[PDB]
Design a binder for this molecule. Structure first.
Ligand SMILES: Nc1ncnc2c1ncn2[C@@H]1O[C@H](CSCC[C@H](N)C(=O)O)[C@@H](O)[C@H]1O
Ligand SMILES: Nc1ncnc2c1ncn2[C@@H]1O[C@H](CSCC[C@H](N)C(=O)O)[C@@H](O)[C@H]1O
Ligand SMILES: O=CNc1ccccc1
Ligand SMILES: O=CNc1ccccc1
Lengths: 257, 268
């Protein structure tokens, strides 16, 4: 909690979204894998609606590239002001914004609709209506008078819960808290680190709860979801770089029931 | 009739050709806007991609005829030919290609075209890889004059005969008349092996275009004049499509009415 007060957005982006982890040319990397999970899921046509909320967006937007063409009202969120600012810089095309164009290009490539990456970014920027503070530790993560339409038709969340929870039970409650934001019958797309215990963001050294695939599945069931899909990416040696001790990445497609 | 005079005018006029103006006029927006699928850029790239996707156009060696300062016309080709020769009449164009080959920052930026080719080829290739492969496969950049019976000269470096030819907006842009156009086509055809393929892209019913201070004269040709010249030169026409230039893409840089793409196979 106080650890996140030293969290440096630029250090985080450099660590996870610039080469090598940010090289998208090799389809066997973690970046293409993530984008693929997202794209394939939305391509089913079963994840749809009017409103969507991204939970713990941090300073990144890649997690919404495939989502944005299925949801007209999108809400992005984060605990930290500095992350919300970094997002605003990209949404408003302000100076020094992070360059997400390689990810936008690869989403267009993967989706296979012949869309140009500029149109994709345009649609995302237009459909993200707001960027709000959030704390998944709170029973009402967004607060009381939320400007965000509730409940949402769908949730997305990448690398938040395990990264803000000291242990399983805390992870489980955090999942409980965000689930209240989701309409019954709605969809949650959850991405996260597997068996990770720490990662770095500049001066910040963050603690993570190491979770397994089966622990993720069980937590989803406990929270009232049917697990439609749960896949694992094993982190290859050359992508183990000293910025963390992640062993793999999970993708879960869950439906509130 | 005597050919020298018309050829002399053409060579003279091209001494004023400005590569950067030409690039801005034709390969930056609006004509360089690749987001609109109905634009001329995506159409050209589509013709090339679909043709190479048939698998029917392959071999070891390819020659691009009148490359000028552009490389888009080879984006889909480069995965099918180990050895690629680029060519142009003007040293200033060859220099511009030199800059791109060295990946210099001052070079024209073709990355939107590279990305779009990757997008429509549908193999999930990243654009950095496409560009790296093109740079690796261009083995030489050579002077050329299509009005000469041997356009590359005698004892040229180029592997002859080639398995395939590509040529975009060259023949009609350097030929004073239809007879000249036909002869130019005859000349480049000597470079292609029997059974080899020619991919020809060009302007329809155009009489002029701008390249900075240079305002050049073009022989206006129709689709049926293009088909006949190809037949006359000893080709079977496999494909010949027409793009009609939208009014919003008529920017005053030329009086082009449309664009043709011909896929032709040399009889042999
Ligand atoms: N108590 C809390 N409630 C909700 N989000 C929190 C939180 N404490 C930290 N966060 C945010 O959780 C994020 C983890 S980083 C994940 C970044 C992005 N979602 C991605 O896909 O790369 C950080 O941005 C951090 O600021
Ligand atoms: N006598 C000649 N023989 C072969 N090419 C010539 C020529 N005279 C001029 N050219 C070249 O013909 C080109 C026409 S511009 C077209 C350039 C490029 N292939 C494209 O696709 O946009 C110019 O580069 C010009 O220098
Ligand atoms: O630790 C969390 N961030 C992370 C982001 C992308 C890939 C692997 C880890
Ligand atoms: O050369 C004149 N017209 C032209 C039109 C589109 C692309 C290249 C050239």
């Amino acid at each position: 909690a106080s650890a996140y007060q030293r969290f440096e957005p630029r250090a985080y982006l450099r660590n996870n979204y610039a080469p090598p982890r940010g090289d998208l040319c090799n389809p066997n990397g973690v970046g293409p894998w993530k984008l693929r999970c997202l794209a394939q899921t939305f391509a089913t046509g079963e994840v749809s609606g009017r409103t969507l909320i991204d939970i713990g967006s941090g300073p990144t937007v890649y997690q919404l590239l495939s989502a944005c063409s299925h949801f007209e009202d999108i809400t992005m969120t984060d605990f930290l002001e500095v992350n919300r600012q970094e997002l605003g810089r990209w949404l408003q095309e302000e100076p020094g914004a992070f360059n997400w164009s390689m990810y936008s290009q690869h989403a267009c490539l993967i989706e296979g609709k012949g869309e140009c990456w500029q149109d994709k970014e345009r649609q995302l920027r237009a459909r993200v209506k707001r960027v709000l503070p959030i704390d998944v530790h709170q029973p009402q993560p967004l607060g009381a008078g939320s400007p965000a339409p509730l409940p949402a038709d769908a949730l997305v969340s990448a690398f938040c819960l395990e990264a803000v929870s000291p242990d399983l039970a805390s992870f489980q409650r955090a999942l409980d808290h965000i689930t209240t934001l989701l309409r019954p019958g709605g969809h949650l797309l959850l991405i996260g680190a597997l068996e990770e215990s720490w990662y770095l963001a500049g001066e910040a050294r963050l603690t993570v709860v190491p979770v397994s695939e089966e622990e993720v599945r069980e937590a989803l069931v406990r929270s009232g979801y049917k697990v439609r899909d749960l896949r694992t990416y094993i982190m290859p040696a050359h992508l183990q770089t000293g910025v963390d001790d992640v062993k793999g990445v999970f993708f879960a497609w869950a439906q509130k029931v």
